[PDB]
């Protein structure tokens, strides 16, 4: 997921 | 109200931990980087100095301007600030100037610190005609587009610098991943520069 | 509850010194290192790296009713308990480059991911085709497995690592090591991060 | 009456966030840089490492007290006082305060703060070995206030020094401090700064 | 004018810069 | 009592400025240095940059409690710590690890930070087979033996199982000895722990 | 009174911002530098990195207590005490305190603070290899107070130059001199004091 | 035991 | 004035320096 | 006195050192 490469996305979506 | 009354109110009703999301709409943060100097370029890190003009609205800070000052200078420790960070940063941002923001009677906050920071940018071809383009990715560290919305030669750059600015471009990038409904924003600052000759 | 109400409650009932052990069972801490850049390599056998430390755990005392309230809030780590994670082979004090804020979910889940610049003792090899391997041992500094249980993928490069770096990542493998000594009944856990890389 | 009372009053009525603008008149800030040492010159990236005393004076009438059967002056830590938001526009490093962060406050409300600062600047260090030497220009001013809130003033300035280190690798030729007041077409208020010109060369 | 080149001016005039 | 109750009691009755001298007897401090890495050696200036674990143990009966946990992790800011300093130190000790100590129900405090520090040592002949023997003198900065008694956990003469295999240097022997000197002027004795690090270059 | 009682009293009646001037007489501050090591000498920048113990003593009568059935001395952190605003007027770096920031307070009100300081100074290091060596001048004094508020004194000591100096140092101490200079300017009635420390040293060979 | 080589073990088992 | 070369003297005498 | 060579001793005995 491209989300995991983003800091705000990683913490907001528990990849 | 006098300056002392306005500053006391801001200090006493200070919620720097609380994001000023008014009517569930994101906080419109406007960022603009104005480059002052390019100090070191080493064989692949770049050490630069830049003014980070950051503007946003915090309606809770607002006051009646009638028979009162239109603007006041408030230390950022008493205000909420966006959690902006450069994703490609190698060093901790060093604030060189007094940590004060300008707050208008309508609740608008204008903070512009001078920052000395090192970045990961390919140093190969700095002496060449085209130079080397340095990409800087600024965005909120923990908030999504529904909480903090980020929006983007120089007449600020030192004549005594060893380097020369070719072009500075600042673009907004909004990406929505397949996993997640909320969009993710960033401001991509591309610094094109070369060594003087 | 609004964001201000949630943040006030967290701040007022703040126990950062207190480990959120829910009835004897340990705090399940999940750690994952995502390498962004390898800056300096000195031969001293040292390596200067920048990495994102994705740390997740549950703190049930921070939980709130998500009905007609935000699902998540951004809280400064000074208001929260954090695990005493440390790299055993670290030669430098970890330098946090990003805003010291964690994301707290309504169920009590804490997600903290700072960008850390740190130097490590590693066998540098670096110019060779096989590339030098750098072993990092992360674990709790004062708690055993019965108080804090550490957990880690074994591949990926990935989209994190800078294309403008002088070095190139070959493979990153994060493994859990649980050792129970003869002396002591409690087990001792650590996450071994193997970073094999080479010069471009 | 005594030092302890004066210091307690200053501490308790401390408003360091509040600019002491009396009757809507700006705060008259007087700045004067006295160069102590020039440590390093980077002819490559046009940098200069310098140590200087920043004599800053202003009036804060709210700090005033009756001098009759009381001390005329007291030493107050700057954390308990409002200080002007002065910054060097051409600064490349964070100003490093080397001395105790204490100011001298007079019974009339006058504040005298003079810290020793080690700072790096972007300067044309071309021909530092030459007889004419290099001229390093530093522009000081308020970071967030205009002339109607803080009025900056240079306190003569020519030519220095009795302050500069005799053991330094460099030699001061002339130090000039001038006030520059510019009013832009956009805006009615004026914008002030103190331009400090440091002419120096390498010794024999 | 050159208000935008000045730090005190840029923050004092949001309408101009 | 639960962990939260124990930590609240320690925090509320916190006297880090107060030495826990029980019945006018000194605080028995036990110090032991475990070398992790030797980074830089400057034979020109006779300096050495080292990483070491400083195992410090002492008793503070005011922290004691007792169906409750046997041990808790307390931040050192909430506890009194001995004013130990290396007289042989050229740099400020840099604490690399979380500043937490382990407090046992009996009042025993176990603090073991990882410290990066530079020292003045005779690094003459580091490349030789005999190597260089770097000596460090640790002691209380302001207290005498009747207020704080400093003692070495080992002797040792043990080398290391904690020292990095990837280091450019190799440990030959580590010797920690207690030195108690009573001067003619003064009735109270003066103590120190002399650490002796024998090491050489691998080649 | 026990140690805890004495330390609580000092903490509660703590006025670190207030100079302990008794009967409008100045605070007699006694300063003495004891050199431990000379680390770096930079010929390029004309600098010197020195390690030294700064023995600072003064009296603060408000800290005094009855020594009868009570400890004679206690160790107090300097954050709870008033300290003189001493500075090297010619220093190029911020003084780095290497040791625990604790002072020894005697029952009579005497404060003895002796931190180990690592500091860089402006030094003409040309001829450090010569027989005569190089001399470092350190001018120590109060940053904001005059002689009528803080008086500064170097002590009668002159026979300890190398008593604390590391045997493993690359440099060697020749002569250490700490003299008191009292200058009264024509403008002003109050005298101005400073302690001039001269450190004469050379490279070993 | 290898407990002494571990920081969490050394402080938990007063090696 | 020699007073101006002294830090304690400068801050104590605003009228002179 | 050997006391004067020790930091703890020096501050503990102002009469001797």
Coordinates of C-alpha atoms in Angstrom, one line a residue, chain B residues 39-127:
Chain B
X39 CA 25.6 27.1 2.4
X40 CA 27.1 23.6 1.9
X41 CA 26.8 21.0 -0.9
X42 CA 28.7 17.8 0.0
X43 CA 29.5 14.5 -1.8
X44 CA 24.8 14.0 -1.2
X45 CA 23.4 16.5 1.3
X46 CA 22.5 20.2 0.9
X47 CA 22.5 22.8 3.8
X48 CA 20.1 25.7 3.2
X49 CA 18.6 28.8 5.0
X50 CA 14.9 29.7 4.2
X51 CA 11.9 31.7 5.5
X52 CA 8.9 29.5 6.0
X53 CA 5.8 31.8 5.6
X54 CA 3.0 29.8 7.3
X55 CA -0.5 31.3 7.5
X56 CA -3.8 29.8 9.0
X57 CA -6.9 30.9 10.8
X58 CA -7.8 30.3 14.5
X59 CA -11.2 31.9 15.1
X60 CA -10.9 31.3 18.9
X61 CA -8.1 34.0 18.9
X62 CA -10.4 36.6 17.3
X63 CA -11.3 39.9 19.0
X64 CA -13.3 43.2 18.3
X65 CA -10.9 45.6 16.5
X66 CA -13.1 48.6 17.4
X67 CA -11.1 50.9 19.8
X68 CA -8.5 48.0 20.0
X69 CA -5.2 47.1 18.1
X70 CA -5.8 45.4 14.8
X71 CA -2.8 43.0 15.3
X72 CA -0.5 41.6 18.1
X73 CA 2.7 39.7 18.3
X74 CA 2.2 36.4 20.2
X75 CA 4.9 33.7 21.0
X76 CA 4.0 30.4 19.2
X77 CA 4.2 28.5 22.6
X78 CA 0.8 30.2 23.4
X79 CA -0.7 29.1 20.0
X80 CA -1.6 25.9 18.1
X81 CA 0.8 25.4 15.1
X82 CA 0.5 22.9 12.2
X83 CA 2.7 19.7 12.5
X84 CA 4.5 20.5 9.2
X85 CA 7.6 18.4 8.5
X86 CA 9.9 17.8 5.5
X87 CA 9.7 14.1 4.6
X88 CA 13.1 14.1 2.9
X89 CA 14.8 16.0 5.8
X90 CA 18.1 14.6 7.2
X91 CA 18.5 17.2 10.0
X92 CA 16.2 18.7 12.7
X93 CA 14.9 22.2 11.5
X94 CA 16.9 24.9 13.3
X95 CA 14.8 28.1 14.0
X96 CA 17.2 31.1 13.8
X97 CA 14.7 33.9 14.6
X98 CA 12.5 35.0 17.7
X99 CA 9.7 32.4 17.9
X100 CA 6.9 35.0 17.5
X101 CA 3.8 35.0 15.3
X102 CA 1.6 37.9 14.2
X103 CA -2.1 37.5 15.1
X104 CA -4.7 39.6 13.5
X105 CA -8.1 40.6 15.2
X106 CA -10.0 38.2 12.8
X107 CA -8.0 35.2 14.1
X108 CA -5.4 35.0 11.3
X109 CA -2.0 33.7 12.4
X110 CA 1.1 34.6 10.4
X111 CA 4.3 32.8 11.5
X112 CA 7.4 33.1 9.4
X113 CA 10.6 31.6 11.0
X114 CA 14.0 31.5 9.4
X115 CA 15.1 27.8 9.3
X116 CA 18.5 26.3 8.7
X117 CA 18.1 22.7 7.5
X118 CA 20.0 19.9 5.7
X119 CA 18.2 17.9 2.9
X120 CA 18.8 14.7 0.8
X121 CA 19.2 16.2 -2.7
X122 CA 21.7 14.7 -5.4
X123 CA 24.8 16.9 -5.4
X124 CA 26.1 15.5 -8.7
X125 CA 26.1 18.2 -11.4
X126 CA 26.0 21.4 -9.3
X127 CA 28.9 22.9 -11.4

